[PDB]
PDB file of C-alpha atoms and ligand atoms in Angstrom:
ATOM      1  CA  UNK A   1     -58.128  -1.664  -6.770  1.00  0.00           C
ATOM      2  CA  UNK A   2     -61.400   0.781  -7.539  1.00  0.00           C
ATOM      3  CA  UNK A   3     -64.015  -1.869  -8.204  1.00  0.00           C
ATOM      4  CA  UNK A   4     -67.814  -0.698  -9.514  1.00  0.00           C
ATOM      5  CA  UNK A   5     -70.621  -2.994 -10.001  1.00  0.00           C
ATOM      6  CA  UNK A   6     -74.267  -2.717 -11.173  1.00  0.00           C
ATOM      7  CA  UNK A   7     -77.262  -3.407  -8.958  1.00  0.00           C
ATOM      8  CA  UNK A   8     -77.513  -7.177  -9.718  1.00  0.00           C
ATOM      9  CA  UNK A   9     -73.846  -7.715  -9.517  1.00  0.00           C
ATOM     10  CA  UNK A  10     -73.461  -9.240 -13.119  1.00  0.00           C
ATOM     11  CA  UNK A  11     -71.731  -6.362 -14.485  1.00  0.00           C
ATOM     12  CA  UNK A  12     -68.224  -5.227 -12.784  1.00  0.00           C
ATOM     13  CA  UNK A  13     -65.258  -2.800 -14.019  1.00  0.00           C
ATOM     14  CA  UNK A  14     -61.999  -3.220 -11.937  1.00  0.00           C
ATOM     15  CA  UNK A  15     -59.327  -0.352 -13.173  1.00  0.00           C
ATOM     16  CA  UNK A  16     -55.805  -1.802 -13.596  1.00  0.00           C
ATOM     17  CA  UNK A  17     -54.368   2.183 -14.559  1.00  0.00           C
ATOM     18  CA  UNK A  18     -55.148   5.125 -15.177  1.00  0.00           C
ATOM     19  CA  UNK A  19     -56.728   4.628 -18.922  1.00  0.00           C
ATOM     20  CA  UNK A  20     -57.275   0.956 -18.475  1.00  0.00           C
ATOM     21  CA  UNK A  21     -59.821  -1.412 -17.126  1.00  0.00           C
ATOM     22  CA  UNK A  22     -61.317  -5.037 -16.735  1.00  0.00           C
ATOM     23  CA  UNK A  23     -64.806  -5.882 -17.497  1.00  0.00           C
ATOM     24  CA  UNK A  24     -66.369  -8.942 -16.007  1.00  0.00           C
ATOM     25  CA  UNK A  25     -69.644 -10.188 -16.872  1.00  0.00           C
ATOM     26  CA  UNK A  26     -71.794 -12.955 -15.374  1.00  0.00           C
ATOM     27  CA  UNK A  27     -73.681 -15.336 -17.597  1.00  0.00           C
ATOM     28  CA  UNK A  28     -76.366 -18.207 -16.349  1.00  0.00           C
ATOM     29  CA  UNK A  29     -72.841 -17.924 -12.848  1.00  0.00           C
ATOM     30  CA  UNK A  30     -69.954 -18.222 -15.707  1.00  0.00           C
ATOM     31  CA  UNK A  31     -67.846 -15.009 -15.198  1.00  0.00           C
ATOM     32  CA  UNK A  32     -66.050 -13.500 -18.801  1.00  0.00           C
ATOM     33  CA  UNK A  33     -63.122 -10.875 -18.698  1.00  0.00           C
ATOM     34  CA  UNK A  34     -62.196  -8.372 -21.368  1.00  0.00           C
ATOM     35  CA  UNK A  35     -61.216  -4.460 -21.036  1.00  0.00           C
ATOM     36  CA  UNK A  36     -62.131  -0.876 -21.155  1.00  0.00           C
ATOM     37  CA  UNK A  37     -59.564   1.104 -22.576  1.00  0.00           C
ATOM     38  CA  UNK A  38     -60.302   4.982 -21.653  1.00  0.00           C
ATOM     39  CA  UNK A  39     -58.924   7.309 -24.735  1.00  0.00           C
ATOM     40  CA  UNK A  40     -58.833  10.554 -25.769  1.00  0.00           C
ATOM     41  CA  UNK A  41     -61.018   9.532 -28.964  1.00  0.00           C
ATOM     42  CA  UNK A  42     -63.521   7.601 -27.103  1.00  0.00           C
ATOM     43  CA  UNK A  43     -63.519   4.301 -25.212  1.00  0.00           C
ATOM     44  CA  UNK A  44     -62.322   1.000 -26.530  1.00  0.00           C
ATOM     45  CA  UNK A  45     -63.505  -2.518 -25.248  1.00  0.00           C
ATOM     46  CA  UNK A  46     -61.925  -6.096 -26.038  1.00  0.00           C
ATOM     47  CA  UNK A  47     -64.340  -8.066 -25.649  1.00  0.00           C
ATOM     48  CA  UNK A  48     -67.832  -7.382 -26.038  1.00  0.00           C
ATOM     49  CA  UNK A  49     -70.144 -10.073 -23.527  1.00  0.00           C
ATOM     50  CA  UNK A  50     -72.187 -12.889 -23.647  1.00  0.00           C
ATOM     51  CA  UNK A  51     -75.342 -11.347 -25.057  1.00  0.00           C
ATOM     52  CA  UNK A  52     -76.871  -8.034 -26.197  1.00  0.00           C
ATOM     53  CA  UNK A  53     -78.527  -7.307 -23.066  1.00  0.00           C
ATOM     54  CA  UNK A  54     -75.157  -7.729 -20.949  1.00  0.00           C
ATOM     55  CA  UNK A  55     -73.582  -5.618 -23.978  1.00  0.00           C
ATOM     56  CA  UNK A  56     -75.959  -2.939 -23.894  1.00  0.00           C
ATOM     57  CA  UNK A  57     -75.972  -2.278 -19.785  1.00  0.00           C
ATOM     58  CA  UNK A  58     -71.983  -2.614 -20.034  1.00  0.00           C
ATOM     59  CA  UNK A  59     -71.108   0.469 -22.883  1.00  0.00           C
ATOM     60  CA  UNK A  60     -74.096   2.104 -20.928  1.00  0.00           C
ATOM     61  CA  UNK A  61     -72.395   1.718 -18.048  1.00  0.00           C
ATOM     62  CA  UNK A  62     -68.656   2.760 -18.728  1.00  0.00           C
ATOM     63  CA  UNK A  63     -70.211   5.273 -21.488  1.00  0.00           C
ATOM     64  CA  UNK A  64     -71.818   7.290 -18.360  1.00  0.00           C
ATOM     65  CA  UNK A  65     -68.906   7.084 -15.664  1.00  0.00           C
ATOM     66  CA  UNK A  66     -66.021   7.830 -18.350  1.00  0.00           C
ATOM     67  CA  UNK A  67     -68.287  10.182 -20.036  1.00  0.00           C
ATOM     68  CA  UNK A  68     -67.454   9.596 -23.313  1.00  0.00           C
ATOM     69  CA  UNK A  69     -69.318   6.754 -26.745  1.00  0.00           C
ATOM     70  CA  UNK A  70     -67.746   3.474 -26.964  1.00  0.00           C
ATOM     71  CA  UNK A  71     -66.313   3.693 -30.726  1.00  0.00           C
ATOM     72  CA  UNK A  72     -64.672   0.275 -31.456  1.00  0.00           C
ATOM     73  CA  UNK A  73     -64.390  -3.284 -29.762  1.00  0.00           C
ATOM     74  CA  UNK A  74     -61.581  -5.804 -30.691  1.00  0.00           C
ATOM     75  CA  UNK A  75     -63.537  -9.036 -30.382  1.00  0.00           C
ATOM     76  CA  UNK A  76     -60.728 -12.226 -29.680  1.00  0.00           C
ATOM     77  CA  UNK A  77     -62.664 -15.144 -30.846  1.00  0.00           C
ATOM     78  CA  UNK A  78     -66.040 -16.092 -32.120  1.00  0.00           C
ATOM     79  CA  UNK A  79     -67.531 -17.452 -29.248  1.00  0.00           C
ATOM     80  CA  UNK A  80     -70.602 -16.311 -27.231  1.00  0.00           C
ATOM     81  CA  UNK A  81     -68.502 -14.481 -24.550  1.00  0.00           C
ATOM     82  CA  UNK A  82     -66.924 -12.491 -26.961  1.00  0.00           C
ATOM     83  CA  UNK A  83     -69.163 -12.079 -29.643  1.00  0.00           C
ATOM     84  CA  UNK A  84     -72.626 -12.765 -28.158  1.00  0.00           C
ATOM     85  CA  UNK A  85     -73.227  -8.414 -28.341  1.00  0.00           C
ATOM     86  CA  UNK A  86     -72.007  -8.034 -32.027  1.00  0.00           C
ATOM     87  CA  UNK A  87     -75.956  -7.655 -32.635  1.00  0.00           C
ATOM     88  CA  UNK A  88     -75.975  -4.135 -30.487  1.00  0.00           C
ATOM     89  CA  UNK A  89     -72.507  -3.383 -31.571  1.00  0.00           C
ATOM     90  CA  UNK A  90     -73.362  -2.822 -34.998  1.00  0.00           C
ATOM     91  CA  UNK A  91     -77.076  -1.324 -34.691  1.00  0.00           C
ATOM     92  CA  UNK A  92     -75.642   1.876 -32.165  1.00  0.00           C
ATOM     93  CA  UNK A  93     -72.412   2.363 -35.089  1.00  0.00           C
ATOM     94  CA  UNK A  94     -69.216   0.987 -32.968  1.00  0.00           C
ATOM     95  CA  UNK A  95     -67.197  -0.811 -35.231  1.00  0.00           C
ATOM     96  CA  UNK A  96     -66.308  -4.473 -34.393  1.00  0.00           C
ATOM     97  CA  UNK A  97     -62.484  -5.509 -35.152  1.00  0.00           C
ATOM     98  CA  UNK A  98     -61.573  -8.802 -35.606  1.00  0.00           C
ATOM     99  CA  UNK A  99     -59.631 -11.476 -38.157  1.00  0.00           C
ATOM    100  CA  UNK A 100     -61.365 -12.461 -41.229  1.00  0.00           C
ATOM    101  CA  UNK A 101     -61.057 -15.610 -39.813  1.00  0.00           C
ATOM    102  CA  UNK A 102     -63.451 -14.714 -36.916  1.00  0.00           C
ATOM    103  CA  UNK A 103     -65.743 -13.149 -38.655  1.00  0.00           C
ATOM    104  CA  UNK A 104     -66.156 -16.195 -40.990  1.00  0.00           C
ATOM    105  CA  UNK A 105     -66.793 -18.124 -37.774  1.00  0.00           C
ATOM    106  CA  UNK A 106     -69.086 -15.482 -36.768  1.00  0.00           C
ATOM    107  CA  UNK A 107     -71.507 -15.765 -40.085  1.00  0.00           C
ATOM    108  CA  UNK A 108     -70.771 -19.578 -40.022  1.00  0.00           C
ATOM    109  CA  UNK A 109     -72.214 -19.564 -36.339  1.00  0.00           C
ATOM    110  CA  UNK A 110     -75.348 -16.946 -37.683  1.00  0.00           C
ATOM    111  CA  UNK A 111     -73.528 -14.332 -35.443  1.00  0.00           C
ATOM    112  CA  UNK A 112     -73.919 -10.878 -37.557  1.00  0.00           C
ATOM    113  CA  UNK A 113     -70.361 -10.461 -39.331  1.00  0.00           C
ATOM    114  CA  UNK A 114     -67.347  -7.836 -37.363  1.00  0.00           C
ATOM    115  CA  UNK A 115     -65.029  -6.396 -39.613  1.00  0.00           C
ATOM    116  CA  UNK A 116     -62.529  -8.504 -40.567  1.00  0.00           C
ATOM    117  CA  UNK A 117     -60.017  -6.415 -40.777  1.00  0.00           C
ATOM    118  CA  UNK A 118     -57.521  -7.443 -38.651  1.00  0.00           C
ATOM    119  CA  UNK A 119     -53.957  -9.532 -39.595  1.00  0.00           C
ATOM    120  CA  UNK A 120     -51.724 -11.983 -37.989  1.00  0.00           C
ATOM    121  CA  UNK A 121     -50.377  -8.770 -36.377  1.00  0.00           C
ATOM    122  CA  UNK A 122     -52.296  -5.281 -36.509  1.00  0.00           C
ATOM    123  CA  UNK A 123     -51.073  -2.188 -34.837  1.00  0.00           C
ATOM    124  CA  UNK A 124     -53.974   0.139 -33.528  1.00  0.00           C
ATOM    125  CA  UNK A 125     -53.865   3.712 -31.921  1.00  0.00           C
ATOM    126  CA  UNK A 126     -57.161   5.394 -30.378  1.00  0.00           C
ATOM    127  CA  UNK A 127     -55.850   8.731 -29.208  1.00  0.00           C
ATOM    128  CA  UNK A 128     -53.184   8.385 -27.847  1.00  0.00           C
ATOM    129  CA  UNK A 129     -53.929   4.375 -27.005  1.00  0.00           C
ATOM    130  CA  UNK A 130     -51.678   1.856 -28.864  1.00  0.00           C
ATOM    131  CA  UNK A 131     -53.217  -1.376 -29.353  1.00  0.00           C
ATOM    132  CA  UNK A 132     -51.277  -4.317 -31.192  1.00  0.00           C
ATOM    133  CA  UNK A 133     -53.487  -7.389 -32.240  1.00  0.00           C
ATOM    134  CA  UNK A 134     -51.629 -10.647 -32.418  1.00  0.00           C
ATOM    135  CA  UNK A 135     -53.157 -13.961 -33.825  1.00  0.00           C
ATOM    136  CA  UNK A 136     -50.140 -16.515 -32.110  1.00  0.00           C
ATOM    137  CA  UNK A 137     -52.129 -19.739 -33.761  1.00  0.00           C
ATOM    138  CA  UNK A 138     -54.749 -22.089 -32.528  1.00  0.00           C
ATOM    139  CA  UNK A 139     -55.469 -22.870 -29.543  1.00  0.00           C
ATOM    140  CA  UNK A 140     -58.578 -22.503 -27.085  1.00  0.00           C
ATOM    141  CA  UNK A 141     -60.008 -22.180 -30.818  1.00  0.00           C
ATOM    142  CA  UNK A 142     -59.005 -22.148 -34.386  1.00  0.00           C
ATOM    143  CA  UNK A 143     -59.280 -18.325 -34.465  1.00  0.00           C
ATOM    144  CA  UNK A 144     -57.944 -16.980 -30.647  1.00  0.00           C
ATOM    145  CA  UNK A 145     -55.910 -13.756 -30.687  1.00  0.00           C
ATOM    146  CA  UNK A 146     -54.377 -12.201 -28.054  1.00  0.00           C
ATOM    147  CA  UNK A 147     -54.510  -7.938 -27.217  1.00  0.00           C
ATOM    148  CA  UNK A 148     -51.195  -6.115 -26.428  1.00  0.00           C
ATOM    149  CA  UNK A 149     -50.864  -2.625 -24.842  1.00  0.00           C
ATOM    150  CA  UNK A 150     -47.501  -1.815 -25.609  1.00  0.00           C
ATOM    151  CA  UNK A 151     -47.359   1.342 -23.312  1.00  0.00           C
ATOM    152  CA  UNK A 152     -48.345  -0.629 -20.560  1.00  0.00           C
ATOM    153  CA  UNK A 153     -47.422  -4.456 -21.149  1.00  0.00           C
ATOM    154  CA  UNK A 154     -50.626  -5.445 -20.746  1.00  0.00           C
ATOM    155  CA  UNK A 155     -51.482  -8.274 -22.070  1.00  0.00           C
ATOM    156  CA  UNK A 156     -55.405  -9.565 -22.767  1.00  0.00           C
ATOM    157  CA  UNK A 157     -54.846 -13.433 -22.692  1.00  0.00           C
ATOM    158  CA  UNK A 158     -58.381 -14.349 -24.077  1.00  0.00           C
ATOM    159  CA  UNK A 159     -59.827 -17.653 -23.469  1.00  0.00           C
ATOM    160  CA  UNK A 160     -56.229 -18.826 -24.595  1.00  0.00           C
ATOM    161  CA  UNK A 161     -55.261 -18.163 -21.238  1.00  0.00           C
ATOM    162  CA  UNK A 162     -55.659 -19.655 -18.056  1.00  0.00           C
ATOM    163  CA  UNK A 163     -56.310 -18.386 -14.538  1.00  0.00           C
ATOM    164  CA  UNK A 164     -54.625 -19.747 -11.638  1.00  0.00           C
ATOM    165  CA  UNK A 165     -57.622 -21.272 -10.374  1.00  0.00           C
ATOM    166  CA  UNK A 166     -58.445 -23.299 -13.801  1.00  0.00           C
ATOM    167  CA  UNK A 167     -57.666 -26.519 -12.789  1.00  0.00           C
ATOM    168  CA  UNK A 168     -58.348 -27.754 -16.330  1.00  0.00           C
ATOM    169  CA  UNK A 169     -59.060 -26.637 -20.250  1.00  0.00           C
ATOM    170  CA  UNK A 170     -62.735 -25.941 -20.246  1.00  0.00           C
ATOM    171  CA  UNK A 171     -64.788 -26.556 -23.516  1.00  0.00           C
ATOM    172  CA  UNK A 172     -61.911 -28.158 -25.550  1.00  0.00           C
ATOM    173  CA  UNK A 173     -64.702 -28.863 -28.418  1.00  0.00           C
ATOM    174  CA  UNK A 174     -63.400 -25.957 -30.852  1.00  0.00           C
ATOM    175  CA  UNK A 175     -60.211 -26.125 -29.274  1.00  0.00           C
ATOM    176  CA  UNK A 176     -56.412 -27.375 -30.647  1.00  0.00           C
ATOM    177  CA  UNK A 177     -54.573 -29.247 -27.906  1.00  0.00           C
ATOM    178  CA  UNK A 178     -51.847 -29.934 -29.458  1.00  0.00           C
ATOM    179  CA  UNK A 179     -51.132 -26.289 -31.497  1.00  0.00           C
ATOM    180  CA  UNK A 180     -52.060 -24.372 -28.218  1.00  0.00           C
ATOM    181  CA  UNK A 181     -48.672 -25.469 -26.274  1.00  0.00           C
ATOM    182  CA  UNK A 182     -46.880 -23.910 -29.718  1.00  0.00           C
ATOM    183  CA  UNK A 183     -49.195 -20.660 -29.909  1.00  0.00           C
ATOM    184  CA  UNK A 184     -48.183 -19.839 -25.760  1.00  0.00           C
ATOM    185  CA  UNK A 185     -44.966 -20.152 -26.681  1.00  0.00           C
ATOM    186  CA  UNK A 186     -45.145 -17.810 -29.836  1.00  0.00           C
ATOM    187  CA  UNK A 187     -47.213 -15.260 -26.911  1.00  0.00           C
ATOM    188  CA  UNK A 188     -44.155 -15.502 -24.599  1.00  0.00           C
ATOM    189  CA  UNK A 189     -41.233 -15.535 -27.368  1.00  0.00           C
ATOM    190  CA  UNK A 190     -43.194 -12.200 -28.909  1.00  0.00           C
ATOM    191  CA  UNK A 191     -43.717 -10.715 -25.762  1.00  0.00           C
ATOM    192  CA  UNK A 192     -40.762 -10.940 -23.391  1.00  0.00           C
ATOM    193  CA  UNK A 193     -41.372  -8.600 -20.466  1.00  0.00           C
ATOM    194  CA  UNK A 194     -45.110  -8.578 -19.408  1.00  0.00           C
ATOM    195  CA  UNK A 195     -47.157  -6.524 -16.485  1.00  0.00           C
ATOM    196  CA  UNK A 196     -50.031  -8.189 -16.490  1.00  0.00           C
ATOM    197  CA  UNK A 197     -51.772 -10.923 -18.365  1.00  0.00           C
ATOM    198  CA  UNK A 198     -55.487 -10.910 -18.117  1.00  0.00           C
ATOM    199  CA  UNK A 199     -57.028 -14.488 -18.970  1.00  0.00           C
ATOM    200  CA  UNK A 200     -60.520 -14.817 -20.757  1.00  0.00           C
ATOM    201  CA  UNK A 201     -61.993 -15.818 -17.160  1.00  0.00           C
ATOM    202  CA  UNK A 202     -60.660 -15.551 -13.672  1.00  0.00           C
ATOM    203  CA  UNK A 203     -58.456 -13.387 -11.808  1.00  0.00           C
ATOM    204  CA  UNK A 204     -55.968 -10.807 -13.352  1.00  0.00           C
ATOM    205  CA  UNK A 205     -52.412 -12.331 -13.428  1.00  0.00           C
ATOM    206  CA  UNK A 206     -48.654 -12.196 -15.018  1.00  0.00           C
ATOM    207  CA  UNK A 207     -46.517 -14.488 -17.114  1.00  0.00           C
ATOM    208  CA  UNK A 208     -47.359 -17.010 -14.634  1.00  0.00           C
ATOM    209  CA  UNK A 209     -50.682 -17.571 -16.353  1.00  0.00           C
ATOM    210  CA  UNK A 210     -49.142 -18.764 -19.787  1.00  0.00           C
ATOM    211  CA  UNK A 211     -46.601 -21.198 -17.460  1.00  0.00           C
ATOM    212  CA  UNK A 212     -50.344 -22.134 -16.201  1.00  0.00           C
ATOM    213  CA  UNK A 213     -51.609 -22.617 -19.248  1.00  0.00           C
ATOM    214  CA  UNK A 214     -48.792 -24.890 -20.134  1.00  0.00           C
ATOM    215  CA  UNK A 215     -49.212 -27.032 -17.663  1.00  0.00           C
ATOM    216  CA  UNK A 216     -52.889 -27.596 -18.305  1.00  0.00           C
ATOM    217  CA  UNK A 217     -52.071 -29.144 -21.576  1.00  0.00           C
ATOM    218  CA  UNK A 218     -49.660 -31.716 -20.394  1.00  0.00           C
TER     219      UNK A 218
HETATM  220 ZN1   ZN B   1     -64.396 -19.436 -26.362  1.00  0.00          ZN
HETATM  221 ZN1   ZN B   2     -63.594 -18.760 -22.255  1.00  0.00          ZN
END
């Protein structure tokens, strides 16, 4: 349960394993999850934060402790919690995964542009790190995916995915009500046994989240 923090308290890492941790950022107090994924080729984040000053203290952050460059982030949708540090990403030379459909979004939005170069499903390894993208439809928006860790079943929910103490939906403006019962369902059908399930905000959680999440949208 090794917790570290920065001075103000804004910027927090919690290590689930060995190679794997959360990141939790507070924006103005709105908290945003995504990971740190420790490799042998570098470090890998889903998710970068809500701006580029968050960004920038966060890879300077878990660049110092793990002692190695961030190289890549998988960012899950093109919101400002996700996206807002695609700015810094791409001045310092990380490359900045995502659908074509996000990055679209992204321009469309006057966010700079990630990659694009993720599918519907995308298999990644950094190092020794497998990483399987997985877009399971619409749902919290048009363009949500969802991060797999096969050799851990680990699961990064996104903003998809509800904690247990979201007691409702949250912005539902870009969101798909009705698709987002079907796209849970494709997350649970696709994966069957799961470890943990980390939701886009809120505590870290299993397969109960997505029965959560379920419920929400009766
Ligand atoms: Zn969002
Ligand atoms: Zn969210």
């Amino acid at each position: 349960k090794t917790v570290i923090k920065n001075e103000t308290g804004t910027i927090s890492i919690s290590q689930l394993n060995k190679n794997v941790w959360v990141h939790t950022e507070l924006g103005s107090a709105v908290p945003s999850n995504g990971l740190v994924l420790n490799t042998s080729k570098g470090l890998v984040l889903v998710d970068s934060s809500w701006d580029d000053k968050l960004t920038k203290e966060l890879i300077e952050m878990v660049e110092k402790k793990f002692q190695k460059r961030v190289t890549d982030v998988i960012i899950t949708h093109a919101h400002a919690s996700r996206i807002g540090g695609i700015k810094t990403l791409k001045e310092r030379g990380i490359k900045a995964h995502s659908t074509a459909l996000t990055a679209e979004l992204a321009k469309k939005n006057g966010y700079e542009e990630p990659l694009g170069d993720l599918q519907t499903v995308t298999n990644l390894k950094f190092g020794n790190m497998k990483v399987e993208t997985f877009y399971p439809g619409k749902g919290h928006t048009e363009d949500n995916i969802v991060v797999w860790l096969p050799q851990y079943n680990i699961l990064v929910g996104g903003c998809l995915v509800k904690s247990t103490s979201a007691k409702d939906l949250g912005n539902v403006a870009d969101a798909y009500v009705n698709e987002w019962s079907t796209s849970i369902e494709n997350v649970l059908k696709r994966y069957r046994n799961i470890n943990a399930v980390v939701p886009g905000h809120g505590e870290v959680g299993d397969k109960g989240l997505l029965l959560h999440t379920l419920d929400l949208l009766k």
